[PDB]
């Protein structure tokens, strides 16, 4: 098994640590979901090929912008990543965490990924945003901004349902494989 | 890490760890909180199990083992020492207030009421200046580290033969060199999130409320600090290339 390390990215509230919790335990935890994800290395196998996939957290770092960037040496894959129910969060995508992604990780796929998607249709989060003349992020509003931003691909999840999740880690290693 | 500390943090939550019967005798909020105090514990001993790998596995064996040019094991493993001796003596804080807190005859049940002391004065003071310069300079060295290990690994047999032998055991499938530098470099930003969410369960005392505060505001004082004192040094950077910056 060949060693590649994914690191994810996106604002605070984007939900990045819980995506890497549920991921890591195929596991929406029960009755405690930890604040902070250390690391984790998942063996993973896709389309027969056989790898370590190391993962990484960048949150906490958002706003030091010297110790930030030591989380991204030797990256073979980047998730960049926001939240459905943060028109927000992905405004912030194109040109801020864009441009610092492929100075750090040049030639590094990136695939965007849309957390949250259970929030998609649920009335108390709808009813929210309205009062910031806002509404939930629709899918042809995350494939435009990935094609945009010359993303290798866009997916969605929930970290709530799992569903989704397998198909991130899986697709990102795949990414992560390629010349 | 001990065995007696690896048991006491063995359980995913403090909620797991006590026993039901003294789990059942606290209302919700108590153990929300402890939930996240025990959370901050558990990843502080992991955070010094981690120097201990790279003081005693990596370093110490590199030193016992290897013939490598002198100023080479200092490049790969900058303030090992000085970083140990900072976090086991912030750990020891943290696990005498929890023996402290033991009910008579038990090992596993108690609440931590005061924590907020303990972190003002652990990010206070002299501490907080040696965590300033100790992590100002880790931290402006990690790129160097990272390519020296990088070169050793892809050039010297008996290098590559140590690392494959000391990293071979499932023990050590997340703490590989450039591993532990990056959990290590990533340990004191996981703080504020750590405190903020502590500090989100502790209103019911408001002394308490108010000390975490305190300690809240002075983590990132010293994370600022920190991240102004940075400037990645490179092996054969010239000096024009540094009054360039
Ligand atoms: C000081 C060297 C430098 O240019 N750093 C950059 C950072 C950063 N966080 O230091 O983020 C960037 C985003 C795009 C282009 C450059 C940078
Ligand atoms: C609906 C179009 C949009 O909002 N943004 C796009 C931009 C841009 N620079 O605004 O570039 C694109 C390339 C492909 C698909 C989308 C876009």
């Known amino acids: ?179 | 890490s001990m065995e007696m500390d690896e048991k006491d943090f063995a359980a995913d939550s403090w909620s797991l760890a006590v026993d039901s019967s003294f789990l059942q005798q606290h209302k919700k909020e108590v153990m929300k909180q402890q939930d996240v105090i025990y959370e901050l514990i558990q990843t502080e001993l992991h955070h010094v199990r981690t120097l201990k790998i790279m003081t005693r596995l990596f370093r110490t064996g590199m030193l016992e083992e290897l013939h490598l040019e002198p100023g080479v094991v200092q490049g790969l493993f900058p303030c090992v020492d000085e970083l140990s001796d900072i976090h086991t003596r912030f750990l020891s804080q943290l696990l005498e207030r929890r023996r402290q807190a033991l009910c008579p005859g038990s090992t596993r049940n108690f609440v931590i009421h005061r924590l907020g002391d303990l972190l003002i004065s652990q990010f206070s003071g002299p501490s907080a200046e040696q965590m300033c310069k100790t992590y100002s300079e880790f931290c402006s060295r990690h790129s160097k580290a990272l390519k020296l290990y990088k070169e050793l690994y892809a050039r010297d047999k008996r290098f590559q033969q140590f690392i494959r032998k000391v990293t071979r055991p499932a023990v050590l499938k997340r703490h590989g060199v450039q591993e532990c530098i990056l959990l290590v470099t990533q340990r004191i930003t996981k703080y504020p999130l750590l405190i903020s969410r502590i500090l989100q369960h502790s209103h019911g005392i408001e002394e308490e409320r108010q000390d975490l505060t305190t300690a809240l505001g002075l983590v990132k004082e010293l994370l600022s600090n920190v991240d102004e004192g940075i400037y990645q040094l490179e092996k054969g950077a010239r000096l024009q290339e540094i009054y360039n910056r």
Not at chain 1, 15 to 29: E, H, M, R
Not at chain 1, 128 to 143: D, S, T, W, Y
Request: charged share 30%.
């Open chain 1, 1 to 179: 098994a060949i060693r590649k390390k994914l690191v994810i990215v996106g604002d605070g509230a984007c939900g990045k640590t819980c995506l890497l919790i549920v991921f890591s335990k195929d596991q929406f935890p029960e009755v405690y979901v930890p604040t902070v994800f250390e690391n984790y290395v998942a063996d993973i196998e896709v389309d027969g090929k056989q790898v370590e996939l190391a993962l990484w957290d960048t949150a906490g770092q958002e706003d030091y912008d010297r110790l930030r960037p030591l989380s991204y040496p030797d990256t073979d894959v980047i998730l960049m990543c926001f939240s459905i129910d943060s028109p927000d969060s992905l405004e912030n995508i194109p040109e801020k965490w864009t441009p610092e992604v492929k100075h750090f990780c040049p030639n590094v796929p990136i695939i965007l990924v849309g957390n949250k998607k259970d929030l998609r249709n649920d009335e108390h989060t709808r009813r929210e945003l309205a009062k910031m003349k806002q509404e939930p992020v629709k899918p042809e509003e995350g494939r435009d901004m990935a094609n945009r931003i010359g993303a290798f691909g866009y997916m969605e999840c929930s970290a709530k349902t799992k569903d989704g999740v397998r198909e991130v880690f899986e697709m990102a290693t795949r990414a992560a494989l390629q010349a």
